[PDB]
Ligand binder design. Structure first.
Ligand SMILES: [Cl-]
Ligand SMILES: [Cl-]
Ligand SMILES: [Cl-]
Ligand SMILES: [Cl-]
Ligand SMILES: [Cl-]
Ligand SMILES: [Ir+4]
Ligand SMILES: [Ir+4]
Ligand SMILES: [Ir+4]
Ligand SMILES: [Ir+4]
Ligand SMILES: [Ir+4]
Ligand SMILES: [Ir+4]
Ligand SMILES: [Ir+4]
Ligand SMILES: [Ir+4]
Ligand SMILES: [Ir+4]
Ligand SMILES: [Ir+4]
Ligand SMILES: [Ir+4]
Ligand SMILES: [Ir+4]
Ligand SMILES: [Ir+4]
Ligand SMILES: [Ir+4]
Ligand SMILES: [Ir+4]
Lengths: 173, 173, 173, 173, 173
């Protein structure tokens, strides 16, 4: 409310609510990815666990944005959450490519919100993103890129072998 | 898949996916309730914590249904998640009345799914609900009813006093 | 005996004795599977251990049915135990396919006995199966389906390699 | 001195000395608030302790600015410290309203100094404020806003009762 | 200086300074190798760690030569450090072949310095090399030769598979 709010633009407030929606949508996408990889006809436990942990991380990012919205005196506003883009996610390679597309969209939204905060001279917002989001995102995208390279190296002429071995020897089970 | 699926009707599979959507919608409603009670112009920490814990419990119930869907060889299907019914939730009394309406709707959906499983002669489904959902729901609704009675006793002619005291002396902070 | 027996039909009593015979036959089949995979010309220790543990689990299921027969005042009656269907079990894939066929036959027998207990209004029998058998069976069939998918992914053009790797990196040795 | 000073404008140096004076004035105001609430005719121990802890926090903020002034090679310059604005502070509500006015003035001074550092291309100054001051201030103002809402809810028709209960059940004694 | 120097030829002093330059150049080459294998488009963590540890070992060898130069009363003289021979290092096989070429050049330089010390009748120099360098080098070259043989065995017709498996199952991650 107006009792605490100071230097917190309506533009930033609305963009924070939109970013919460993006993070919750990302969490829902990773929930779907995780359950897909634990199907009995997919059965890649390490892949399930990789995506189920990202579902939790994106939920936690949304909750940190909502706490910050309250700390600044803005008002959380929730919108409908669209379902994920696919019902079935293909191979581990297809899924990791979809994940890095999703993370680069989150990263661009973070960068756009940082730029709006810079333009609004809102240093608390800019520091909040720098401290809790921007490096987390760069680290995750680097990890996904490392995984993509290793998955791609393993396809060879024996795709099933390579998919098994990546899950067994890189991912956590 | 067809490799494991046995005695698991398409009707139950679809109703489980719908119930996952109801539980995730309930979780999203409790997320909104919790952040509303931590606004600086609402500021009831025990109420925030009560609803934020229910958001986590409803998420966990959705995840247990999704794991069971996979264990039976059905296929998780996600739909859009509608936003909660309100953006602002009024008093603790208004919020607890909305919560018990929400929980009785979840309970009726559980009872309806139990009845479908009974009709389909699916004892694993029926036991799953009895073991992980039906008593959890009766316990929670009893707790909410106890809270409603205590909140109602505290309104008197001093509503703000009563709301403070309930939060301080019943709810966990 | 007639001193304790109450609400325990002769139909359920006989079907419990038949199910004991099915579980003991299953145990004997898994004993044969385990010793086959420890032959020096087969030599897959993780596969031996997987099936030898199922031999013990099926024995224990038969013993829990026999204890329940006594607790209800029925009379255990033992029949001849037929030998397993094969003397040699082929590849790990062949053996896991035979195992899931065997487990779905046990599961159908459990479901049939639950339906008889339901028809006889024998809730102790129905609860006994729900509590100690039906979920154990769904969990095991899901595990076997996961293993089948992973074994099938590993066949590729290098079947021996895939069989080794599954035993080494999925099964316990 | 000139031996270490680099990228540290005379404008920032002077504004840091002014901000030290503001923080020390704030500390002196909170010292007065704390002793007022421990008068025998006021006697609100939790309120005394709340403000006496803020006196220490504002002192520590002044000392961190002075250490930074020295680390950058500027020169601390002290001015007279004006007495607090009141000798008696009224009710807990009056005192919490005066406190949030004081904290929003400190926050605006921090934001103004951040803007000067941005304009001077002094990233060490900007990071120093972001890291040790801006979030501390947003957190404190949110806490005070939460307290104001709870104090206001407790006034009702029984102001003394409400003041007692807030001190007893929210503030630390 | 002349206060301590005894039996320490100007020829050995100069050759020690040259060997320090060779060891520091080797360290810089291994730094480049390590960062190359942690690129997101290379992504072989065990290979990165193998070479980053050799960068540290070659630095430490240079520092032990410099300490000995001082202990004997010679004067350390540093020269420009040439950049490594490549900016990109190819496959793990290419990199391990370049590493063994580099180590055999260091070993030959050690042997040449031992021969100069022998010729100069400088037994402290000869013992220093025998005690801290010659066996370290033979051990490392044997390890690299073992790795080369294993990498070469893994190329087969599936080079990416083999590169992954070597990194996963031989190198430390
Ligand atoms: Cl959509
Ligand atoms: Cl809606
Ligand atoms: Cl037979
Ligand atoms: Cl004054
Ligand atoms: Cl060069
Ligand atoms: Ir910025
Ligand atoms: Ir490992
Ligand atoms: Ir993990
Ligand atoms: Ir039932
Ligand atoms: Ir209590
Ligand atoms: Ir709690
Ligand atoms: Ir039943
Ligand atoms: Ir393992
Ligand atoms: Ir085991
Ligand atoms: Ir800045
Ligand atoms: Ir308390
Ligand atoms: Ir305290
Ligand atoms: Ir020698
Ligand atoms: Ir090992
Ligand atoms: Ir290591």
């Amino acid at each position: 409310s107006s009792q605490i709010r100071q230097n917190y633009s309506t533009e930033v407030e609305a963009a924070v609510n939109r970013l919460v929606n993006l993070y919750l949508r990302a969490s829902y996408t990773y929930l779907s990815l995780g359950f897909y990889f634990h199907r009995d006809d997919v059965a890649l436990e390490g892949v399930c666990h990789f995506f189920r942990e990202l579902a939790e991380e994106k939920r936690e990012g949304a909750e940190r944005l909502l706490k910050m919205q309250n700390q600044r005196g803005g008002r959380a506003l929730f919108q409908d959450l669209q379902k994920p883009s696919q019902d079935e996610w293909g191979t581990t390679l297809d899924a990791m490519k979809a994940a890095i597309v999703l993370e680069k969209s989150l990263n661009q939204a973070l960068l756009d919100l940082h730029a709006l905060g810079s333009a609004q001279a809102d240093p608390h917002l800019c520091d909040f993103l720098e401290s809790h989001f921007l490096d987390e995102e760069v680290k995750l995208i680097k990890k996904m890129g490392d995984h993509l390279t290793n998955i791609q190296r393993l396809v060879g002429s024996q795709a099933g072998l390579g998919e098994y071995l990546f899950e067994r020897l890189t991912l956590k089970h």
